[PDB]
Write an enzyme that holds these catalytic residues in place. Sequence first.
Site, PDB file in Angstrom:
ATOM      1  N   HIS A  62      35.466  41.248  42.056  1.00 19.65           N
ATOM      2  CA  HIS A  62      36.615  41.339  43.463  1.00 19.65           C
ATOM      3  C   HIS A  62      36.928  39.236  42.825  1.00 19.65           C
ATOM      4  O   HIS A  62      37.791  38.629  43.373  1.00 19.65           O
ATOM      5  CB  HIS A  62      36.363  40.949  44.431  1.00 19.65           C
ATOM      6  N   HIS A  92      33.271  30.691  46.092  1.00 20.70           N
ATOM      7  CA  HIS A  92      34.333  32.003  45.187  1.00 20.70           C
ATOM      8  C   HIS A  92      35.827  31.004  45.495  1.00 20.70           C
ATOM      9  O   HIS A  92      36.225  30.474  46.232  1.00 20.70           O
ATOM     10  CB  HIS A  92      33.652  32.864  45.804  1.00 20.70           C
ATOM     11  N   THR A 196      37.965  37.732  54.572  1.00 17.92           N
ATOM     12  CA  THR A 196      38.911  38.140  54.493  1.00 17.92           C
ATOM     13  C   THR A 196      39.577  38.964  53.210  1.00 17.92           C
ATOM     14  O   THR A 196      39.709  39.069  52.561  1.00 17.92           O
ATOM     15  CB  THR A 196      39.749  36.344  54.179  1.00 17.92           C
ATOM     16  N   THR A 197      37.882  39.670  53.353  1.00 17.23           N
ATOM     17  CA  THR A 197      38.098  41.328  52.611  1.00 17.23           C
ATOM     18  C   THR A 197      36.866  41.922  52.820  1.00 17.23           C
ATOM     19  O   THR A 197      35.809  41.268  54.103  1.00 17.23           O
ATOM     20  CB  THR A 197      36.576  40.601  51.044  1.00 17.23           C
TER      21      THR A 197
END
Length: 258
Positions: A62, A92, A196-197
């Site tokens: 991801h 990330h 946000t994931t």
Amino acid sequence: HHWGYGKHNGPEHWHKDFPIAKGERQSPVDIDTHTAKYDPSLKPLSVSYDQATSLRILNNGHSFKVNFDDSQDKAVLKGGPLDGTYRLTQFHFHWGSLDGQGSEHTVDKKKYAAELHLVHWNTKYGDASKASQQPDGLAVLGIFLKVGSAKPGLQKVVDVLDSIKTKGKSADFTNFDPRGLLPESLDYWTYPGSLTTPPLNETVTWIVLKEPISVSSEQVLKFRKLNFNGEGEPEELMVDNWRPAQPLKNRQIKASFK
Ligand SMILES: N=C(N)NC(=N)NCc1ccc(S(N)(=O)=O)cc1
Ligand SMILES: [Zn+2]
């Protein structure tokens, strides 16, 4: 049929397995700079990264993520809108297929080429797993990337990416200093939001820096060589791994600056 960023598993599908995707406190959001209110009560942010200990870098299918030793208060975020001490656990990025997209947050609808997330947990909850479930458990420092001049402090990251091309690959990544990823100014916007994931938990105090960092075309092109897929699966470039802006609903975005 795991979540991702494709047509059949992307952001518009996530609510089926994570119903909070339609919640009251979802991230990212568009930052309307002329509606955000300057808050003179906010503190300067305190970013204390000198004793950071990076450990490993991973492609999880991801993004890519650098983990840190968060077993004591080595790299911490304090002040600003936060009460207490928040430990850095990982960073990330999210990025685009083209330089004109890639950020999660937007500023007056402007998309940046990419967005860096430095993820921190509130030490009052003891561990990141427990903190992730609390309304004030996490603090994510978001930094925009625009394409222009190279960012020297990013180069160690992009030079290791060829070793973690596919999902599940990791590499040693010690002695990386995240201070090299910060802009000059710590002026910021802040609001209550979410991961946000998936799992999209509504447990994040967002702190989004106003000043973007510049990275070179060559640097962001190397992000786009990563793969969503595992080794020995058909190649699908890891690009456009961003969630669009979500409804602000009953939230106010505060500015640290006038
Ligand atoms: N799906 C997962 N593995 N994610 C997870 N539990 N990690 C938690 C996590 C941490 C930060 C962010 S972000 N993009 O809001 O900074 C998303 C998710
Ligand atoms: Zn993120």
